[PDB]
Amino acid sequence: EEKPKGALAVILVLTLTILVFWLGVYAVFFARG
Amino acid sequence: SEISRVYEAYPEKKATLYFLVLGFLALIVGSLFGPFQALNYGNVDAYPLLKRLLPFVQSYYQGLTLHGVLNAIVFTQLFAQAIMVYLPARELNMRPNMGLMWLSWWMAFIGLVVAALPLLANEATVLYTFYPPLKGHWAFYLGASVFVLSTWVSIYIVLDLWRRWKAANPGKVTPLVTYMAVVFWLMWFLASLGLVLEAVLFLLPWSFGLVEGVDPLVARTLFWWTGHPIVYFWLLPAYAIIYTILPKQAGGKLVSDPMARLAFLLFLLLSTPVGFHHQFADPGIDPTWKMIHSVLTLFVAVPSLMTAFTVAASLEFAGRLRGGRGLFGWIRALPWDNPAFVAPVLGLLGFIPGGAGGIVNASFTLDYVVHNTAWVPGHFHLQVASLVTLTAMGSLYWLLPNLTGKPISDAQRRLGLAVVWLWFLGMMIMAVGLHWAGLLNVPRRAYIAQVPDAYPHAAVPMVFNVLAGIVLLVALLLFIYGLFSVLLSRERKPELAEAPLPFAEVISGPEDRRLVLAMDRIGFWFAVAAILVVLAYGPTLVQLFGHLNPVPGWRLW
């Protein structure tokens, strides 16, 4: 039909989850430096 | 001497079943220790009870070895061997060399038994990583060796099937499932070398008394050569099912054949030369090489990242054909009444947190935060204990019938959905509990319920670990009940044992051809993969082998 709105919404959640994990632990790394 | 014309016509069906059964049996036995390990990480010590039930159990650690071995090693391998041989066989409609296929089952069985004896007798309480100097009984190492080598036969069988098919279809592109299976086994072959080397050069002569010392650094370097790719060896069979079977179960199609091929190709290329990510905290390994492996490891994440989109789009597609509404309508349109659909979809949900965990672990310096903590078990239960297992569990609903002719009643189908949801839910709760306690420096591989006051700051995540343990205990029980109810009924519709596998249709495009063609240069890509391994491991391994420092073995249980 058209643009994969649901699939893009999924990989958005994935991307945000990746960012919270990575930046969340990137912060703790420097907090314990 | 064969009672059903279904097995005379499709003998591979029988061999497949034996792999499966043996696989799930090992899954059940190994998983029993799970609930107790969770309670342990909830600060509750239930082991006396376990000890009363299973007398042979001598400690927390023996139970953790059985858990890691029977679940992560045995179950997974057998499932793989079943899936990555049977599916490509049925797709090609070709019979695998049956002499060899039965040979591979006996190897796995004999190897399992031989290794089981010293494990069950507390002669091998070293965990599923069996790091030296910790010295187990010889029959553990021999048993494992044989069991793993079983795969080499499997590799041959598939390659054979592939050559034969290419002969009867000159100039035709490898069909999808077969392609996957082929790159899969080839990848495994290259991956397995690390372990083989460790076993052949050190482990086996060590445990037989030929040598008295083993260098610990080299042994664990070789181990992780195999160590990482093996998890992909666990993952890809599920992936195979997810790409080629799940879309059908969802009521849609695989939206891209080339995408799936690419994903698998990348895995062949990038699965093995990344083992140093398991060795960040090790000494004697150059920091530059660690960074290199760190980069290659972030690249091996790419295939998964593609999978995520390809599969999600296929599920969105399926949902739309079912009458999918808006941004989220497709989701509700899916068949949430069918376990074979539900199980893997849940697995994929938890895989998101799982993968994010991995990428973190993969970032060199950031590993120092979480290494050897409960975070790592948190990571992988989302990966293997959730996605792989659920997929395996859920595939029983089409697979078991296809092999046995035994139908599944509506009662079993609903029993399955409960098991599925509970397992998933339980896994999610534990994931939170272990990740939380892992950031709170609680170590893994620890009987911390024997030292109650050691970790007071993990008060609340300890609760989640208790909850999960209960939740999952119930689910496991229900699985056993439901699994046997199916394997112990005499209802037999031989027609459904002859029905084709519910493979999904694949949407193809114009540009496919030339890309697909390129990927089908298997011999080229194999050598390429081989070269990467020599490039990423060669330099280091050379220096280690020049300066071997073997130390004596220990028994500390």
Next chain:
Amino acid sequence: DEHKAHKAILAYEKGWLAFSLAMLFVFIALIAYTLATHTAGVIPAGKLERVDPTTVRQEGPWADPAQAVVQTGPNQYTVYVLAFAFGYQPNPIEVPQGAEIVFKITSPDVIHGFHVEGTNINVEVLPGEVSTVRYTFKRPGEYRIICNQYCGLGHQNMFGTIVVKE
């Protein structure tokens, strides 16, 4: 329909791939950053430093626990730690905060973990090998060492103590 969705997905797929790769390379840049800072000290020494595990507490820097700490620079103190079957030597390790503490850890039996709670110090200790990590404490107190690598039946009870000096 179906063949229209094929082109749309494969187009957003390429955009997703480009974005993913870009995000990964940012990570690679933010990891390359931490390697140029002072935090990168916790990275184990790359060069090989072989030792005998059977004579380590008989002859050598790990033989005498009293000579564990040793000022090796104006603000540098080299600590010779020994991780062994269910304990750490010296216990406790005593060092001044603000000073660069160069740990050199080894084991006489099996593999151990050296995890200093609160810090980035997380190194595997290997029998016959010296684990060499550099670290600067910036806060005073009693830092607890945890053994995070399974080392036998007393593994859960293997703890240590570092008392940085106010």
